[PDB]
Amino acid sequence: RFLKVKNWETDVVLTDTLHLKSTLETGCTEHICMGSIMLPSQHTRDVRTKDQLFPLAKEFLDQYYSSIKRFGSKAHMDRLEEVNKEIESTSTYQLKDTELIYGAKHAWRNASRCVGRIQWSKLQVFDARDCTTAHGMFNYICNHVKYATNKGNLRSAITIFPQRTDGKHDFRVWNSQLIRYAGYKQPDGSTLGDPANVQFTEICIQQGWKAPRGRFDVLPLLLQANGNDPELFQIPPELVLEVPIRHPKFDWFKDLGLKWYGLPAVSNMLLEIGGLEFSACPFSGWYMGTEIGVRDYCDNSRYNILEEVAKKMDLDMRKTSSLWKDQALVEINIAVLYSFQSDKVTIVDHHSATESFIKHMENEYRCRGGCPADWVWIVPPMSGSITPVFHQEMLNYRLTPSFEYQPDPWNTHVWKG
Amino acid sequence: RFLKVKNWETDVVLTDTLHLKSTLETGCTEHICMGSIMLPSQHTREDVRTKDQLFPLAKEFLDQYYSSIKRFGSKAHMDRLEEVNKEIESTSTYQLKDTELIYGAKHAWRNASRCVGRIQWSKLQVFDARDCTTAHGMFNYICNHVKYATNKGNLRSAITIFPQRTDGKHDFRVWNSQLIRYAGYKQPDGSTLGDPANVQFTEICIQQGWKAPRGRFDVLPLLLQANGNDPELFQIPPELVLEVPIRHPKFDWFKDLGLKWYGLPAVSNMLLEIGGLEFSACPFSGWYMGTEIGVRDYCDNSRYNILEEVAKKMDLDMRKTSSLWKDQALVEINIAVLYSFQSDKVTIVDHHSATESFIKHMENEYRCRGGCPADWVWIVPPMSGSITPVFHQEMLNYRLTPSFEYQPDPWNTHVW
Ligand code: HEM
Ligand code: HEM
Ligand SMILES: Cc1cc(N)nc(CCc2cc(CC[C@H]3CCN3C)cc(F)c2F)c1
Ligand SMILES: Cc1cc(N)nc(CCc2cc(CC[C@H]3CCN3C)cc(F)c2F)c1
Ligand SMILES: C[C@H](O)[C@H](O)[C@H]1CNc2nc(N)[nH]c(=O)c2N1
Ligand SMILES: C[C@H](O)[C@H](O)[C@H]1CNc2nc(N)[nH]c(=O)c2N1
Ligand SMILES: [Zn+2]
């Protein structure tokens, strides 16, 4: 069975056969669309039993040996058998290096909500599965941050810590991202710093962090190994590459005191590969401009600098029909890209990223038979219809390997004391 | 199963019980979401209705109607059920009381999951044109609609409902997609004069009689089809076509681009379904959201595509995409559209205002109706999406009835 997606700006039509290889559920039915629910309880992560694990292993191994053109080979049959007996005997199994690398690359490739997937094949996979302590985690993560940053010439990387066993010895990075600024709620109700991070900051402060209480404080890493209580580590500042935000025509923009970090590194998701759950798998790439300029600085629940940017642009801020928000938002985004480019720190505007994804997606349909894509997440958060993805019909379905959400660990962690 | 939707900017959570009543289908499954397909088969509606599937459709519609008027299971309810029941068993169709027609259309709008302007859904002005029999009559009704809805700029919502389908042979259809659209002409050198979305239509009109002015904003003629015959051309009296010249409140050169848009958005090619009956000609109208003209009409590549020249006149660095010159120009074009309409006292809403209105409307539907079907892919404006509150608003999309549905473009179907 085939399916069809059309681009309503170019009249290009692609044919999807890959959705037939889909297993996990969307959340939709024939009578409801959950297409815009943030986390459909299906997209989050309950430790596996041998009952369901071997078909998940087998399915993965088949995909793997297909990709290396060894499907039904002796190496393939023996590997099934090997994983077979290891599951019966130990109730889990271990991935080879080569399998883990394929796994992480394909988890990215299957991330339907990710616009930057054109680069998926060049992921740098750091195997941290020998790690046993939080200190060891801090060391692997520092090496990741140093390698990925690469003095501003960013490289995609992921570091993979030991998989879950019984869900009682989980490895977790309690930060949502490796590098993120603190948020402090004042008694007067205002917020100093990133309001998105108020909750995590207070955990850190309660865990013993001595908080500078500045407006752009990098948070400490809070790291949990083998299901033990998490421990605090300060990333060395020389490792945290930052870009001060200025505007190419507005000399007063620098005086807003804004800076942002260069390295987007998601650390709170779950990497699923052949039924195995890697509960700590920080991954990084490089920023699309709007993630900082539109969301970080201009969401109401974030730094919310729109007002003071518009204030200094002298705009009519009394009636919203003056589009003063839309105007300030564009300037702020112009400034993010200018600041980052001026310092040779890798970054991509949303026009470039979306054109690339269209090309990737077409290429994916040719050589793979489809490319799962979440239109709601792929369309940039500003200037939507002037990017080619807006007019692109997209099929959203769930392939494995996959990245999944998982509950914040502080909600689910039995404390040792 | 009693679902919930969250707003990630406000933490407001709403409980949706209304989806339980959903009758039609979404195009989605558990294995694949199609929330972004432009036209799933379900959103379209030969397919005559048998006497069978017609009475259930009527009963469900009549039941909610009598529920709405606090007379569920009452004398007149059962009688009306019985009455319509008998007319179907005999005529193989049935006719809607004026009040049911009005409730039917207001609710087709209330249920339109892709429409952000639904807060005004109950103030719809319904024009019963079911006595119409010819294209000239259709023309008369549409002229009356247009004048009533324009109201010297003080736009009022309206729908005009032509006779329902019978056997699909006697179809009323407005061949225009909107009652008022600018013309679109090819070129010897391959480019496009005017509006490229209307090039095939502007060609049909000429290839059927219309003598085109071949200007940049020529109002297209109405092409009306009654009872299934050849469609006829009619020129809307220009004095009924309220237009707004587009100037900017900061840039004197903006006037020089020589842009205008019409004030009346009036969709004419959809199909209104009420208790199982299919109204294949039901032109309806309201008032624009700014971005529909400025973002889509002006700046879409396959449309007027004026960003090139606007940015040139702004002296922006059009060398690299990373200057965001398209974005900068896009915001000014949309400031100009709003300023021009407002200055001319023609009704218009900006996308910040209308999305905020839609949040309150969601609030109200969840509080009094238990839900409000909504298509996030169409509710979020095509610019500045994430600084509008609908961006952070989860929405559940389901298909209620009565509804507006797409239908095939008549010039493929019509036995000419
Ligand atoms: C290299 C440049 C990259 C760019 C420009 C990029 C861009 C984006 C953007 C804009 C989003 C939407 C999320 C949001 O805006 O809130 C996203 C989502 C996502 N990205 Fe990418 N990304 C990149 C690399 C990567 C890498 C290396 C991985 C993993 C190996 C990855 C995995 C994901 C996943 C799993 C999501 C889904 C998040 C969710 O479901 O909430 N991306 N990406
Ligand atoms: C009064 C002000 C109104 C505003 C501001 C408004 C706004 C919109 C917008 C922005 C869209 C998205 C489609 C697009 O961007 O091209 C839309 C779709 C739609 N509107 Fe509303 N509208 C209004 C009145 C009405 C009325 C009076 C009706 C019918 C009685 C209606 C029915 C619809 C329908 C059915 C759709 C979606 C078509 C589909 O399902 O694909 N609207 N509207
Ligand atoms: C590697 C990488 C590259 C680039 N460019 N951007 C990012 C951040 C996007 C990103 C964001 C999230 C969570 C955001 C959602 C959850 C709450 N909030 C609304 C989860 C990811 F997995 C991810 F990728 C990451
Ligand atoms: C009454 C009214 C008020 C305002 N403001 N805007 C509109 C236009 C929106 C609108 C647009 C369409 C179809 C457009 C689709 C087909 C190709 N293109 C992507 C079908 C509608 F039913 C509708 F409503 C109407
Ligand atoms: C393919 C995609 O569904 C298509 O471009 C849709 C997306 N969202 C839209 N939203 C609105 N309001 N109007 C549109 O025409 C569209 N087009
Ligand atoms: C409610 C809705 O699901 C939520 O706001 C989503 C919409 N699309 C998004 N798209 C991106 N890229 N990032 C986001 O955080 C979101 N948030
Ligand atoms: Zn769906």
Are A96 and A226 found together in one domain? Answer: no
Name the strand (E) or helix (H) holding B281. none
Q: Is B115 a catalytic residue?
A: yes
Range list of β-strands (E), B86-239: 125-128, 158-161, 173-174, 184-185, 193-194, 222-225, 232-234
Are A277 and A371 found together in one domain? Answer: yes
Burial class (CB in 10 A: 0-12, 13-18, 19+), B217: middle
Contacts of A9 in chain B (CB under 8 A): 300-302
**A324-342 vs B325-343: helix crossing angle, rounded to 10:** 170
Technique behind this structure?
A: X-ray
Give me the count of residues in chain A.
Answer: 417
Closest CA to A281 of A131, A160, A117: A160
Closest CA to B155 of B288, B18, B295, B38: B288
Whether residue B189 lies inside any domain: the answer is yes
Q: Is B411 a catalytic residue?
A: no
Whether residue B214 lies inside any domain: the answer is yes
Cβ–Cβ gap B37/A393 under 8 Å: yes
B187 half-sphere exposure, CB direction, 13 A CA radius: 10
B169 half-sphere exposure, CB direction, 13 A CA radius: 1
Residue A268 to residue A199: CA distance in whole angstroms: 15
Closest-CA residue in chain A for B383? A383
Phi and psi angles of residue B151, each rounded to the nearest 5 degrees, phi first:
55, 45
Domain interval for residue B232: 131-156+171-242+406-410
**B75-91 vs B51-68: helix crossing angle, rounded to 10:** 160
A257 half-sphere exposure, CB direction, 13 A CA radius: 8
Secondary structure (3-state) at B177? coil
Are B252 and B336 found together in one domain? Answer: yes
Are A210 and A278 found together in one domain? Answer: no
B118 close to B361: Cβ distance less than 8 angstroms:
yes
The A157-160 sheet, strands edge to edge: A124-127, A157-160, A283-284, A265-266
What is chain B's percent helix, strand, coil content, to nearest 5?
Answer: 40, 15, 45
Q: Which residues contact A188 (CB under 8 A, 6 or more apart)?
A: none
Are B281 and B304 found together in one domain? Answer: no
Closest CA to B275 of B406, B397, B99, B71: B99
Q: Which two tokens stand for residue A73?
A: 């080979």
Question: What string of DSSP letters covers B284-322?
Answer: EE--EEHHIIIIIIHHSTTTT--HHHHHHHHT---S-GG
Are A93 and A24 found together in one domain? Answer: yes
Q: What is the DSSP letter of B31?
A: S
Torsional sign, CA B211, B214, B219, B220: positive
Q: Is B41 on the interface with A (CB under 8 A)?
A: no
Cβ–Cβ gap A36/B376 under 8 Å: yes
Question: Which residue has its alpha carbon closest to ligand 3 atom 24?
Answer: A266
> Which CATH number do you get for residue A81?
3.90.340.10
Cβ–Cβ gap B300/A381 under 8 Å: no
By DSSP bridging, strand A157-160 and strand A13-16 are: unpaired
One-letter amino acid of B326: K
Phi and psi angles of residue A349, each rounded to the nearest 5 degrees, phi first:
-70, 170
Burial class (CB in 10 A: 0-12, 13-18, 19+), A301: middle
Residue A195 to residue A296: CA distance in whole angstroms: 10
Phi and psi angles of residue A192, each rounded to the nearest 5 degrees, phi first:
-100, 120
B355 close to B379: Cβ distance less than 8 angstroms:
yes
Ligand 4: residues within 6 Å at CB?
B 117, 265, 267, 270, 284-286, 288-289, 292, 404
Whether residue A146 lies inside any domain: the answer is yes
Beta-bridged to residue B4, according to DSSP, are: B15
Q: Is B8 a catalytic residue?
A: no
Are A275 and A294 found together in one domain? Answer: no
Whether residue A36 lies inside any domain: the answer is yes
Q: Which two tokens stand for residue A136?
A: 């060891």
Closest CA to A390 of B330, B48, B357: B330
Cβ–Cβ gap B338/A327 under 8 Å: no
B155 close to B149: Cβ distance less than 8 angstroms:
yes
Beta-bridged to residue B51, according to DSSP, are: none
Closest-CA distance of chain B to residue A390, Å: 8
Tokens 């690359």 map to which residue? Answer: A105
**B307-314 vs B325-343: helix crossing angle, rounded to 10:** 100
B186 close to B163: Cβ distance less than 8 angstroms:
no
| Contacting A residues, span 177-216, partner chain B, CB-CB under 8 Å | none
Residue B359 to residue B116: CA distance in whole angstroms: 9
B9 close to B387: Cβ distance less than 8 angstroms:
no
Q: Which two tokens stand for residue A121?
A: 């094949």
Are B39 and B163 found together in one domain? Answer: yes
Whether residue A305 lies inside any domain: the answer is yes
Residue A193 to residue A47: CA distance in whole angstroms: 37
Residue A365 to residue A75: CA distance in whole angstroms: 29
Phi and psi angles of residue A95, each rounded to the nearest 5 degrees, phi first:
-85, 140
Closest-CA distance of chain A to residue B254, Å: 16
Whether residue B39 lies inside any domain: the answer is yes
Contacts of B6 in chain A (CB under 8 A): 38
Residue A101 to residue A273: CA distance in whole angstroms: 10
| Contacting B residues, span 280-309, partner chain A, CB-CB under 8 Å | 290, 295-296, 299-302, 307
Nearest ligand atom owner, CA of A350: 1
Are B147 and B92 found together in one domain? Answer: no
Q: Which two tokens stand for residue A42?
A: 């299906």
A125 close to A105: Cβ distance less than 8 angstroms:
yes
Q: Is the CB of A377 under 6 A from ligand 6?
A: yes
Residue A325 to residue A381: CA distance in whole angstroms: 14
A385 close to A251: Cβ distance less than 8 angstroms:
no
Phi and psi angles of residue A173, each rounded to the nearest 5 degrees, phi first:
-100, 115
Question: Which residue has its alpha carbon closest to ligand 4 atom 23?
Answer: B267
Residue B187 to residue A96: CA distance in whole angstroms: 62
Are B209 and B298 found together in one domain? Answer: no
Nearest ligand atom owner, CA of B393: 6
B275: left (phi over 0), alpha (psi -120 to 50) or beta: left
Residue A25 to residue A19: CA distance in whole angstroms: 11
Mutate which of A24, A113, A396 for ligand 1 pocket (most atoms within 8 A of beta carbon) = A113
Closest CA to B30 of A29, A236, A355, A209: A29
A328 close to A306: Cβ distance less than 8 angstroms:
yes
What total of structural domains would you count in chain A? 3
Burial class (CB in 10 A: 0-12, 13-18, 19+), A336: buried
Closest-CA distance of chain B to residue A47, Å: 23
Are A53 and A161 found together in one domain? Answer: yes
Are B47 and B72 found together in one domain? Answer: yes
By DSSP bridging, strand A283-284 and strand A157-160 are: antiparallel
3-state secondary structure chain A: CCEEEEECCCCCEEEECHHHHCCCCCCCECCEECCCCCCCCCCECCCCCHHHHHHHHHHHHHHHHHHCCCCCCHHHHHHHHHHHHHHHHHCCCCCCHHHHHHHHHHHHHCCCCCCCHHHHHHCEEEECCCCCCHHHHHHHHHHHHHHHHHHHCCCCEEEECCCCCCCCCCCEECCCECCCECEEECCCCCEEECHHHHHHHHHHHHCCCCCCCCCCCECCEEEECCCCCCEEECCCHHHCCEEECCCCCCCCHHHHCCEEECCCEECCCEEEECCEEECCCCEECCEEHHHHHHHHCCCCCCCCCHHHHHHHHCCCCCCHHHCHHHHHHHHHHHHHHHHHHHCCCCEECHHHHHHHHHHHHHHHHHHHCCCCCCHHHHCCCCCHHHCCCCCECCCECCCCCEEEECCCHHHHCCCCC
Phi and psi angles of residue B153, each rounded to the nearest 5 degrees, phi first:
100, -25
Residue A196 to residue A182: CA distance in whole angstroms: 9
B195 close to B181: Cβ distance less than 8 angstroms:
yes
Closest-CA distance of chain B to residue A386, Å: 6
Task: Kindly calculate the radius of gyration of chain B based on its CA atoms and give it in whole angstroms.
Answer: 22
Residue B129 to residue A129: CA distance in whole angstroms: 73
Please state the separation of Cα B223 from the chain's center in Å.
Answer: 18
CA of A378 from ligand 6 middle (Å) equals 9
Secondary structure (3-state) at B399? coil
Whether residue B342 lies inside any domain: the answer is yes
Whether residue B261 lies inside any domain: the answer is yes
